[PDB]
Write a protein that binds this DNA or RNA. Structure first.
Ligand SMILES: [Mg+2]
Ligand SMILES: [Mg+2]
Ligand SMILES: [Mg+2]
Ligand SMILES: [Mg+2]
Lengths: 147, 95, 110, 55, 269, 102
RNA sequence: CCGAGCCUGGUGAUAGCUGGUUGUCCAAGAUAGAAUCUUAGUUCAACUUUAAAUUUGCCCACAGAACCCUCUAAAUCCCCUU
RNA sequence: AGCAGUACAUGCUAAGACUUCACCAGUCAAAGCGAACUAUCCAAUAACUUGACCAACGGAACAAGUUACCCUAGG
């Protein structure tokens, strides 16, 4: 072969190897064999595709037991009747981006769960009235006169 | 407009048009509003905002601009990180 | 132009499929393009006249016109407006049916 | 030469460099305002710096 | 059933075709008509003059352009046998298979691989491009292929796209220039798979893409085609197997290499 | 030397949100239900619906000194009337659609 | 015919405004506005030609369109049906 | 009428519209964010920006008298 002064060997002496750039590094990872990934292709009307990732939260060995409990209460609305946490993304045309969005969602859930000091934030306008409605509902509660 | 140049016998482009207009590959022409940089102190925020918009030309103006430019200015271009890349092609246009 | 390589599973990842062997026995035959694609092309004029053209038609072109009319009439809900060019072996259809016609012709074996 | 109102440029004290022209009476001292400053996304003191034009 | 054979059968009865009975196709000739400054509004400022100047096209001639090659197009080319995945795929093979058309005189700097068709891309290829998107790189790597981004200068791009016209000029193969200062960061970055990037970082960057997009990074070292997959040209090499300074003699099917020390030092520098 | 001002949308016409119903130098038509007012007294639709013109009793704002003086000096039993333009919302705000079966 | 000779060339010089502009047939086909050193001219408008795409167009029931004093009548805008 | 008073979120952004009308220009504006919560080119500038009673006001960058010695033009 031909080697110039700018050959990768000369430019990176310490990186001279046949497998230097193609080794598979064995090594918070999410096992992709445990998850169940489904794709719903576009029909026609949305142009963007849909990718769905679901796994059984309670029996998820990879997630820590304290984390699975915190995730269950925080994301109960996502867990279905079978105890499977269901995540969906349809923000992109390509299945690769949709799947990456779902995996990033799983990572944020595990991270958010481990961060116990949840940040105090101003409530959404929807929550504000519900707080006032919940407060008046307690005001109507009475005590059993004779018990 | 020169239809037949003295040295090449070819149509010429009006460079005044190149200075002021952007042609999308779909045939639309984009321009600035006249006076967008002048006398801002005496213009309301709403007037100033519409003066800094990039607006399309009408059909009559677009056909005139097309005649004043040669085919080179109408070719499809693939500039890297072009801000107007998405606007070159029309979508959901029935006509 | 190279001949397409033989594949174990058809259609290929890109969707290409070779013409059936032996040729389908019909009164007309639709030849492939030099690039081994089905010669169905979208065409437009005046900025608004969307049309579909079927080229390289051999045999009874009128038989293809009736077959195309029966196939497209359910989808449109009316008989499709078409032009038969016997000289050039071309069938011109009003509206865009390139994708539907390509799949329809592929099933026949062209 | 003379006008009832003067056009002058107010510079933000935050040092961002955002400035806006404003109208004040000719017979007045240097104007100071709490005009909103986009760069800092909040109201900030503005100091009159240079005369631009006379109305 | 007979449409072509019927027309030829009709011909047998009709008179001999000759120069005396030809005519143009109806509608191909418009009958001639026999009689038997633009942009000036008449005094006011023309519309194209009263609009303010803005740098829409400023520096257009010096902007770099890249022809987009999609994974759909690349897969389609492989499916029809026009690009062979069993050998390194570069601009020459893409151009030779009529997969892309490159115009160096129109400020084309090569092909930019685009992610369109990533979902259905199945081929395993070793492909050299000038620009590649993150999703496009992931699609190729997920199948066990190798993608690298390399820079060609206007002169080098012209030669690589059309080798035979260059060889007929009779000049020695030049060494391709390095990218400009602005591009140097892009081509020395492993995230882009730059040809001038450190080979040691690549494994980390390759793994990060596999994690983000949710696929298992395959081990190409175990692949039978590993030797081809890792085949790459020196940063100064326009063509595989051909060094700068060599003269190609197509008439005699020979290659001439210079032995002068000064010439060899220049070409290898 | 003339300009065009007046009713852009007549009675029974369909308007979309933001449509300019009328332009006026002075208040000739007053804003009714779902009709906004601009700085220049322009009347525009706040909802999608049908334009309606009605005659409604006029009651000015207590802090509108000029208008309050007028009504206080009116003979008792006399009610001021003005022409109001309204938009009758054609569509509902939204609908409840089944999105999941958990 | 020299208020600045004549000749050749530049030169088929420019402007301005007249005049002229050569066989037949068929189809469509007459508008009356704005800017301009512009009103003897022009370019955007009005009308007009050809081809193409698509869906309403015209006529017009009720209801509806301000006070301020309306000469206040004759009318207008909008508009389903037909 | 070729202005003034008096505020300094005359902040940002964005559906849908109006318009002397042709163009240029001009005008109104929901929701949202953040608050409050009651002419052209030219010339100067780091920038943000500013400047021609260009009043013949769609503005040639910049120029008068006179010809009853008149020259040319058509009506
Ligand atoms: Mg065509
Ligand atoms: Mg006729
Ligand atoms: Mg009607
Ligand atoms: Mg709002």
């Amino acid at each position: 072969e031909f080697k110039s002064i700018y050959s990768l060997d000369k430019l990176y002496p310490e990186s001279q190897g046949s497998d230097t750039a193609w080794r598979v590094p064995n090594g918070s990872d999410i096992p992709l064999d445990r998850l169940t990934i489904s794709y719903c292709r576009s029909s026609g009307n949305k142009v963007n595709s849909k990718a769905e990732v679901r796994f059984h939260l309670a029996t998820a060995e990879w997630i820590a037991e304290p984390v699975r409990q915190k995730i269950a209460i925080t994301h109960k609305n996502k867990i279905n009747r079978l105890g499977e946490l269901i995540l969906t993304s349809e923000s992109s045309r390509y299945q690769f981006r949709n799947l990456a969005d779902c995996l990033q969602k799983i990572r944020d859930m595990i991270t958010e769960a481990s961060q116990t000091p949840k940040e105090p934030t101003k409530e959404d306008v929807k929550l504000h009235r519900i707080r006032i409605e919940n407060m008046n509902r307690e005001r109507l509660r009475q005590k059993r006169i004779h018990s | 407009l020169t239809y037949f140049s003295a040295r090449k016998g070819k149509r010429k482009t009006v460079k005044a048009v190149i200075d002021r207009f952007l042609r999308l590959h779909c045939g639309l022409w984009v321009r600035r509003k006249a006076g967008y940089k002048k006398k801002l102190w005496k213009k309301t925020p709403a007037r100033k905002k519409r003066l800094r918009e990039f607006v399309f030309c009408n059909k009559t103006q677009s056909k005139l601009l097309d005649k004043m430019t040669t085919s080179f200015w109408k070719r499809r271009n693939w500039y890297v990180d072009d801000p107007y890349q998405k606007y070159h092609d029309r979508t959901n246009l029935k006509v | 132009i190279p001949d397409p390589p033989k594949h174990e599973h058809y259609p290929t990842p890109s969707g290409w499929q070779p013409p059936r062997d032996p040729p389908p026995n019909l009164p007309y035959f639709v030849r492939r393009s030099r690039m081994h694609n089905i010669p169905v092309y979208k065409d437009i004029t005046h900025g608004n006249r969307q049309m579909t053209v079927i080229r390289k038609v051999e045999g009874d072109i009128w038989a293809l016109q009736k077959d195309v009319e029966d196939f497209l009439s359910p989808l449109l809900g009316k008989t499709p407006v078409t032009q038969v060019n016997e000289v050039t072996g071309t069938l011109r259809i009003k509206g865009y049916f390139d994708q539907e016609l390509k799949a329809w012709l592929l099933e026949k074996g062209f | 030469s003379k006008s009832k109102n003067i056009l002058v440029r107010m510079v933000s004290e935050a040092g961002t460099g955002f400035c806006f022209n404003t109208k004040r009476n000719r017979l007045r001292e240097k104007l100071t305002l709490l005009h909103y400053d986009p760069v800092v996304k909040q109201r900030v003191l503005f100091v009159e710096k240079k005369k631009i034009r006379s109305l | 059933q007979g449409g072509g054979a019927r027309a030829l059968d009709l011909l047998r009865g009709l008179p001999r075709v000759s120069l005396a009975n030809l005519k143009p196709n109806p509608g191909s000739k418009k009958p001639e008509r026999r009689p038997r400054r633009l942009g000036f509004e008449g005094g006011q400022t023309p519309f194209y003059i009263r609009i303010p100047k803005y740098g829409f096209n400023e520096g257009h001639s010096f902007r770099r352009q890249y022809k987009p090659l999609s994974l759909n197009r690349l897969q389609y080319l492989i499916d029809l046998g026009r690009v062979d995945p069993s050998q390194p795929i570069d601009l020459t093979q893409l151009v030779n298979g009529r997969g892309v058309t490159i115009q160096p005189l129109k400020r084309d700097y090569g092909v930019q691989l685009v992610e369109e068709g990533a979902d259905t891309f199945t081929a395993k290829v070793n492909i050299e491009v000038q620009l590649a998107s993150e999703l496009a790189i992931a699609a190729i790597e997920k199948n066990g292929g190798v993608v690298t981004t390399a820079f060609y200068d206007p002169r080098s791009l012209d030669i690589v796209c059309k080798p035979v016209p260059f060889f007929l000029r009779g000049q020695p193969i030049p060494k391709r220039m390095l990218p400009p200062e602005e591009l140097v960061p892009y081509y020395t970055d492993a995230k882009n798979r730059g040809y001038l990037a450190d080979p040691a970082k690549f494994p980390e960057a390759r793994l990060e893409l596999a994690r983000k997009y949710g696929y298992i990074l395959p081990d190409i070292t175990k692949d039978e085609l590993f030797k081809m997959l890792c085949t790459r040209k020196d940063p100064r090499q326009i063509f595989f197997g051909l060094a700068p300074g060599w003269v190609v003699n197509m008439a005699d099917k020979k290659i001439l290499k210079p032995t002068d020390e000064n010439l060899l030092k220049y070409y290898t520098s | 030397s003339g300009r065009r001002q007046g009713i852009k949308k007549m009675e029974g016409h369909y308007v979309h949100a933001g449509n300019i119903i009328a332009t006026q130098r002075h208040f000739r038509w007053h804003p009714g239900a779902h009709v906004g007012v601009g700085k220049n007294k322009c009347l525009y639709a706040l909802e999608e619906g049908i334009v309606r013109y009605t005659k409604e009793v006029y009651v000015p704002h207590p802090r509108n000194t000029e208008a309050v003086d007028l009504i206080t000096r009116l003979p008792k039993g006399a009610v001021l009337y003005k022409t109001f333009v309204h938009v009758v919302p054609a569509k509902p705000e939204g609908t409840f659609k089944l999105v999941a079966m958990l």
